Amino acid sequence: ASQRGSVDGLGSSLPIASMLPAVFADDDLALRFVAGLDDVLAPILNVLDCLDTYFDPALTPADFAQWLGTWVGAETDGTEAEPMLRAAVAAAARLHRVRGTLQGLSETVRLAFGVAPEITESGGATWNARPLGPFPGRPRPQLHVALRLPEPRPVDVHRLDALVAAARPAHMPYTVEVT
Template sequence: MSSGAPAFPRGPRTASERAYLRAGLPSLYRDPGSFAMGFVGGLEEVLDPIVAMLDNLHAHLDPGLAPPALLGAIASWLGLRFDETVGVDERRELVRRAIDLAPQFAEQPGEPKRRGRKGGVIRQRGTKAGLELVLQLSFPDLELAVQDDGVAAASTDPRESPRPSPRTFSVTWSPKTPPSARQRQAIDRIVRDMKPAGVRYRPPGPSAT
């Protein structure tokens, strides 16, 4: 009689269930009651947790399924750091978007355009668009915008080499959804971590409108 509960697919069998080592023994030692079969069967049970981890390694590295403690390690491999105020769901989305368009997965000249791809964190790191993406994924309930004053310098004298003042990033938020003091500190940390070294940063403030 069916209980009505959804049926979930069974995971891979353990090493001992598959006779992981016993199946490789010569037929001379495969007598079910022999010492060799019992001894090797005991070794299989020792290997069960290790083999189970290897069988499910893909799930441990999937941003949507990875244990929260492992998300930080995956992010560090991609050059990302989580702020302590960012929730687990937001962290998963940050890693997912970082992986989607990491440089090694970027479209190459002559390749057909991939469908369904969204802008990624790594390829846009250090840009206005990249900062806005990280802030949007980290604080989905806030309306944040990044301003880039963009500077340039020119001279009519070819012997002169004018030096423009450094660019400056600033962050503004909508008065409708002001961030808390803790969130403002987190925004400050994230931008300072993601911006290029030669770019200045103005602390966040409310937008003019």
């Protein structure tokens, strides 16, 4: 469940009394009683108002953050900390635009641990005006990930092993090194 019941001490943008006829407003019990009925219906107008905030990942309640995660495939499994989810969902849609590229692999692991990684690989770009010139680049594929963690508890390697497994382009062998 969620226990998202009524809230005490909340006003309304549509007071029931303010919509009553004239002369009717002169009474004492009438004004007090009907304003009581506003208490039960108050939070609904709060939701209908400011509904836009109820979709921004950086501000929406925790439940919708996981909901938003499955909305654009944020890979939210295994995270039991609310602040960790906040960055992942908002930044998820940008990663898939460059998922596979070297920056994307670096950022994803940077996202999961908060520190920028060091990576070396059989990659690079070059040009030569010479006709039919050769292209350098290591003849044997190799992908390496290095993390400069300050507190290397011996579980990060598996987490780095698991995370980089889906980041590599099903193409090269990989190895994981953690400080």
